[PDB]
């Protein structure tokens, strides 16, 4: 039995006036499989906000987002817990339609985090919009990805800059597993392969 549930995104409905996913509203994202709208994750989330009587966000609460397989708008991650290495909360995210875009341009924006990898292993389609992955000092693996395998339209481009240098990434052994194809990876594990060179019983090669 497969259960689905659609929830409004940030800037819409119950969260018309919310700046970001916070400790208050994240409870309401429980059981959501699909986000009609956008996701913003901003520094205020973890900092808290007196003005709106919002406590700081507990990083464990981001596990609530693991049910989300689809975002019809855009995904914006401008903050993340420092003691986490990937976007684990979105490990089951499959589609970003980019019907609404950030600044009318980006459907996926990962900016200024201390993550080492993306971890978006279930991601298979970005229907529209560009992808910016910028300012992540410790981020590897991002340059390896075959983004044409994920895009929907020919005009979709990519702005991947100011992350960890491919020099350091390769030197630190932070590269794609040997089982991975040349299509890149979301991380060092065999489950992080975009596709497999030989065979795969499922996610793992």
């Amino acid at each position, epitope marked *: 039995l497969e259960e689905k549930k659609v929830c409004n995104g940030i800037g819409i409905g119950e969260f018309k006036d919310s700046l970001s996913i916070n400790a208050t509203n994240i409870k309401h994202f429980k059981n959501c499989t699909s986000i009609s709208g956008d996701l913003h994750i*901003l*520094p205020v989330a973890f900092r808290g906000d007196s003005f709106t009587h919002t406590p700081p966000l507990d990083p464990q609460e981001l596990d609530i987002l693991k049910t989300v397989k689809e975002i019809t708008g855009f995904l914006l991650i401008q903050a993340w817990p420092e003691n986490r290495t990937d976007l684990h909360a979105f490990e089951n995210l499959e589609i970003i339609r980019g019907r609404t875009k950030q600044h009318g341009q980006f459907s996926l924006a990962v900016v200024s985090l201390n993550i080492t990898s993306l971890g978006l292993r279930s991601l298979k389609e970005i229907s529209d919009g560009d992808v910016i992955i910028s300012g992540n000092k410790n981020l590897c693996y991002a340059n390896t990805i075959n983004w044409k395998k994920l895009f929907g339209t020919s005009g979709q481009k990519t702005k991947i800059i100011s992350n960890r240098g491919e020099n350091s990434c390769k030197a630190t052994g932070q590269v794609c597993h040997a089982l991975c194809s040349p299509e890149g990876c979301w991380g060092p594990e065999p489950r992080d392969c975009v596709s497999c060179r030989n065979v795969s019983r499922g996610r793992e090669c």
Partner: nanobody, 122 residues
Framework: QVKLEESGGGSVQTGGSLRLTCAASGRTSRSYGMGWFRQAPGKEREFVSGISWRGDSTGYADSVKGRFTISRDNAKNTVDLQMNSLKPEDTAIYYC?????????????????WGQGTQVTV
């Protein structure tokens, strides 16, 4: 949400003054810390100045001590940056940023909104 537009940039004579402005649009009627940042070619983005919501507290990078001045008119919903005694080291794209709450911060990791930025060449 909030949108910020930077205005006031351009080219300057080496040693000349200049005044950047940043206008905010949207749900602007709440506590925001505002800050100015910049990014030089081939360099990383760095902190320049910041100001609290009430206007009382401010902060400046060491490289701009004495020269620059920050100010805001919350009625007009703006925040400006005087930049006297400019120098070719100050040549960069300058961004206006916002952090929800009263405080300003000296790093970029705390700011929630960003403008598109204006080029400043000296």
């Amino acid at each position: 949400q909030v949108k910020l537009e930077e205005s006031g940039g351009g080219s300057v004579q080496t040693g000349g003054s200049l005044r950047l402005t940043c206008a905010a649009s949207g749900r602007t009627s709440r506590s925001y810390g505002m800050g100015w940042f910049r990014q030089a070619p081939g360099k990383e983005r760095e902190f320049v100045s910041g100001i609290s919501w009430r206007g009382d507290s401010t902060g400046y990078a060491d490289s701009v001590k004495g020269r620059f001045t920050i100010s805001r008119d919350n009625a007009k919903n703006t925040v400006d940056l005087q930049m006297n005694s400019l120098k070719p080291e100050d040549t960069a794209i300058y961004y206006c940023a916002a952090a929800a709450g009263s405080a300003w911060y000296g790093t970029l990791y705390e700011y929630d909104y960003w403008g598109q930025g204006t080029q400043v060449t000296v």
